Each structure stands twice: as structure tokens, then as C-alpha cells.
Design a protein around this nucleic acid. Structure first.
Lengths: 43, 469
RNA sequence: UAACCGGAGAGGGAACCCACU
């Protein structure tokens, strides 16, 4: 039913459950997300 | 919430630094662990469970005789002589309830050591083991499906034997839920524990990817099954599907690509788990060497002996097995030229990754678990008493029930079960008439603490009313 | 540096005869 997408995909199960709402991070978002994680990973 | 999860995760990482017992800290593989599980040690049935080093229960016995009886001091010694003569252990894992349980453990040690009752011809030390996870792993549903005839004392002895075998397999045999039944901080209930459960799962995945998992035990032993639920890329459904595949077609693993040759697992998912699946048998399939580094690890092993290759995957056996025996030559390999060849074939800066490839060629399937840590008194006290000395504080009033006089002193216990010795300075004697006016023998009396020496069976208890304020 | 015990409202009726104040 709902386990076929977990077991029959070419994506990891932990990787599926690590970006479940929106999957993947593109190339143009990569540097902006790196700078955002650099600003936000420092507190 | 962040610092509470950090304080909980520090205790989790401490508890996720597993250190089960091994033979001499290395006939047969493993140690024949005889776990003892007491119920009251007061003329109550105390159980023993001999589980071998392969991870399976082998024998069991009872012990309803103890030294209840007030004067027959060799009946427990005679019963332990007749039981240890009917058992072939290699390590004795004793639990603990009170300090009388420590005296019973000392009597068991006097029976084992003073008669060579550790192998029937040679003394083998009895190890003190805390019992907090085995008391909550004998009530689990997994321990209710290994046997349905015996009480929870035999399951507690079996849980102590399995914990002495491996604590990560116990953590890999409790659902995660069941991790939230072990408390490491007294403020983890007020905060949300969904991210705490995901951090516990992150630490379990970290431990499982550092140590590694064997697949030839997940199709034979049920205790060593359900280990793919914490592997990289293999979740609960993928681990259960892998176990169903390996138990439905009777599939065994002779290499790492057996789920790619038979179409059991995804290609990218298999490349994610190309350094987290290990088999007992190619030769670099029970290690972290991926299939894109097979002919580089084998090239560095051929270069580690100056042996000409026979189209090496297994054919140049002198360069491949003699390097698994001992490090043959590491001065014939140069990681600068290796990284330069990796920057023209392979296409990637692998210069310190080849140090890990060399470590896998030397001793593959290395375990990052720490060494076994023996109980050092505060670890013993916190284990058998379940109370730490940081909880008590100078300034608090505690009820103590006096039991015996030592010669003039006040020997009593607490409600938590800690033996406290109040000296004559508070009782108001040195050798003079004695402290009945201060406290009543047998009864319990509240007193203000002024010292914390619970490890050495000492407690400062002011019996004067002027010192309580 | 100790010490074993434990469970409680039962339960019927109809018919006839004898006797008491």
C-alpha cells in the first residue's frame, strides 16, 4: 500500500524520510543554502 | 530544549559507547557467560543462565537455598558447588539489588576463586555488572518470545548474558518507544521527545555505521536478526524486506553484490550501503571497501608486498591474506602518488580515504566499540543502589532507620537502601552510655545530613535537634 | 554479621398432627 514507495524506489529509506516534504536541493540553491547554514549554524 | 537534548545525548553517547566482555579482551569463539539473576536472595529462587559466546541460551539452573536460613552457612556454598560442578562457564555476570547482594556476590566469588570453579580446573574472574537495561529488557516482547515457561528472573539472567555479549544488539532488539523507557535526565518529559527520539535514532545509526553489521548471523540467530533497521540507506521497511528476502529464498551472502546480482536491492541504495554491509566470506566484502575501490585496495595490497598480480580479486593470495595477517609494507605505498593516480583515474581526491582503505586491508571489519569497563565503586554504588550521591545534598533532612549498633556507633539504613554509620559524636557518647535518647533502635528518625560518604557506608546524621535547623 | 507461615454468612419449601397461653 504505502510501503511500495519505500521499498521499490531507487532512493534511500533514510534519505526519503530526511527530506519528505520537499526532496532534493538544486545547484542554484546550493550556495545560498550553504551561506544560510553558515549564518544560522552560528548563534 | 536544545541543552536538555544535548545533556540527554551526552548520556546517550556515553551509553552508546558499548563495551561487552570478550575472551581476555581479544577453544571456541566468545565467552560462556553464566548470568546470575536474583529475585530476593532470602531463601527465594535465584536463577542462573549459561548462554554461550555464539549468542544462544545453553543451560539454566535454580537456587532457592541461601545463607531463609539464619545459621546454615554452607547450604548456599554447597548448592553453588553442586551447580558450578554442573556448569561450564567462562565468565560470571552477577546482578545487584542491595549491599547484601554484594556480600552474596562476594560469597559466590569465594566459591568460584577458592575452588577453581571458573572452568572446573582454573579460576576465571567474576565481573561486576550493573543491571538497569537488563531489568527493562527482560520485560520486552522479544524476551517474551524466546521462552514462555520460566519467570522474569531467568529472562533477567538472559538479558545480563546478552548485555555482556553486546549492548548494541540489545539496543538493536528494542523498538524505537522502547528507547524512551530508559531515563537519562529528569527533564526529558517536559520537552518534546520526537526530536529526542530522532537524535537517539541518529546516535544508533552512528554506532551501527561505526561498528558494522554481519549478515551471516541475521539468517541464523533471532537475537542477531533485525540489525538492518539501523544501516545506512536501509530503514525499517527495507531491513524487514531484506530479512524476508534472505529468509524466503534461503539466500546466503558470499559477496557484497549479491543484492545487485539477484536484483534484491537498488543500485544507488546498494552504493549507499556499499561500505556498511559485511559478510563472513570476495575478500573485501566484509569491510568498508566499496565496489569502486576494489581494484584500488587490491592494487595497494599488491604494492604492499611487491607481488605481481594474477588479475587480482583473489588470485594474488600472498599479497591479500598476508596483509590481513599483519601489515606487511606501508613504506612501499605513497599516498601522494596514490592520490595523483586517483586524480587521473577514479576522479576524486582520495588521499586520507586511502588510509582507511589501508586499514581495511590490514584489519577489515574493525569495531569502534570501546573496551570493557569494570565497575569502579561509584559505578557499583550507582548500579546496585540506583541512587547517586549527587542527588543527596548537605542541608536536607533524611529519615534513617537504625538497625544495629556497631560497638557504640549507630549503624542504620535509609529508605533508598544505603547503609549509614552515625558516629558517637552525634549520638553523644565516646564509650559512655548510649544513644537511646538520641534515636530509637529499630524505628526511623529524621536527621539533617552533614556528610556524604555512601560509597564507604558512612553518613553524617545529626541526632541533636539544635543541628537540624 | 540473620529471622517462614494466613482462607469465612451459612441453610429450602409444602402438607398434616400434637401441644401451650
Amino acid at each position: 500500500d504505502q510501503d511500495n514507495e519505500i521499498r521499490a524506489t531507487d532512493l534511500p529509506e533514510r534519505f526519503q524520510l530526511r527530506s519528505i516534504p520537499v526532496k532534493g536541493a538544486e545547484d542554484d540553491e546550493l550556495e545560498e543554502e550553504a551561506d544560510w547554514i553558515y549564518r544560522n549554524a552560528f548563534a | 530544549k536544545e541543552y536538555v537534548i544535548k545533556a540527554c545525548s551526552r548520556k546517550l553517547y556515553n551509553w552508546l559507547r558499548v563495551a561487552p566482555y570478550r575472551p581476555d579482551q581479544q577453544q571456541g569463539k566468545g565467552i560462556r557467560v553464566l548470568g546470575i539473576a536474583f529475585s530476593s536472595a532470602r531463601d527465594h529462587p535465584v536463577f542462573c543462565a549459561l548462554v554461550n559466546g555464539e549468542g544462544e541460551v545453553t543451560d539454566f539452573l535454580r537456587l532457592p537455598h541461601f545463607t531463609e536460613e539464619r545459621e546454615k552457612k554452607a547450604q548456599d556454598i554447597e548448592t553453588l558447588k553442586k551447580f558450578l560442578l554442573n556448569k561450564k562457564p567462562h565468565v560470571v555476570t552477577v546482578a545487584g539489588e542491595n549491599r547484601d547482594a554484594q556480600m552474596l556476590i562476594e560469597d559466590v566469588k569465594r566459591i568460584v576463586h577458592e575452588l577453581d570453579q571458573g572452568q572446573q580446573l582454573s579460576s576465571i574472574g567474576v565481573e561486576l555488572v550493573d543491571n538497569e537495561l537488563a531489568i527493562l529488557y527482560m520485560n520486552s516482547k522479544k524476551s517474551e518470545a524466546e521462552f514462555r515457561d520460566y519467570p522474569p528472573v531467568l529472562r533477567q539472567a538472559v538479558s545480563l548474558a546478552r548485555r555482556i555479549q553486546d549492548p548494541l544488539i540489545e539496543f538493536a532488539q528494542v523498538c524505537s518507544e522502547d528507547i524512551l523507557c530508559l531515563k537519562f535526565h529528569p527533564l526529558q518529559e517536559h520537552v518534546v521527545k520526537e526530536e529526542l527520539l530522532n537524535a537517539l535514532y541518529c546516535e544508533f545509526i552512528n554506532r551501527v555505521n561505526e561498528v558494522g553489521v554481519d549478515v551471516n548471523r541475521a539468517i541464523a540467530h533471532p537475537y542477531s536478526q533485525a540489525l538492518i533497521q539501523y544501516v545506512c540507506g536501509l530503514g525499517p521497511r527495507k531491513g524487514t524486506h531484506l530479512l524476508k528476502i534472505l529468509k524466503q529464498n534461503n539466500t546466503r551472502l558470499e559477496s557484497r553484490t549479491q543484492l545487485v546480482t539477484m536484483c534484491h536491492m537498488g543500485p544507488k541504495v546498494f552504493m549507499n550501503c556499499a561500505g556498511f554491509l559485511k559478510i563472513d566470506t570476495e575478500v573485501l566484502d566484509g569491510s568498508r571497501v566499496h565496489p569502486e575501490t576494489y581494484e584500488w585496495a587490491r592494487k595497494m595490497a599488491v604494492d604492499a608486498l611487491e607481488y605481481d598480480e594474477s588479475a587480482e580479486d583473489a588470485n594474488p593470495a600472498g599479497a591479500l591474506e598476508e596483509i590481513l595477517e599483519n601489515p606487511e609494507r606501508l613504506k612501499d605505498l605513497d599516498l601522494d602518488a596514490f592520490a595523483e593516480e586517483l586524480e587521473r583515474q577514479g576522479y576524486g581526491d582520495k588521499h586520507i580515504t586511502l588510509y582507511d582503505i589501508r586499514a581495511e586491508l590490514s584489519c577489515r571489519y574493525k569495531d569502534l566499540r570501546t573496551a570493557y569497563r569494570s565497575p569502579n565503586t561509584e559505578e557499583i554504588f550507582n548500579m546496585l543502589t540506583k541512587e547517586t550521591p549527587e542527588t543527596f545534598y548537605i542541608g536536607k533532612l533524611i529519615i534513617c532507620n537504625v538497625t544495629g549498633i556497631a560497638h557504640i556507633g549507630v549503624k542504620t539504613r535509609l529508605d533508598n537502601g544505603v547503609t549509614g554509620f552515625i558516629p558517637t559524636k552525634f549520638l553523644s557518647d565516646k564509650v559512655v552510655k548510649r544513644p537511646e535518647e538520641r534515636v530509637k533502635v529499630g524505628m526511623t528518625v529524621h536527621c539533617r545530613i552533614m556528610k556524604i560518604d555512601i560509597e564507604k557506608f558512612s553518613a553524617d546524621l545529626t541526632c541533636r535537634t539544635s543541628d537540624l535547623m
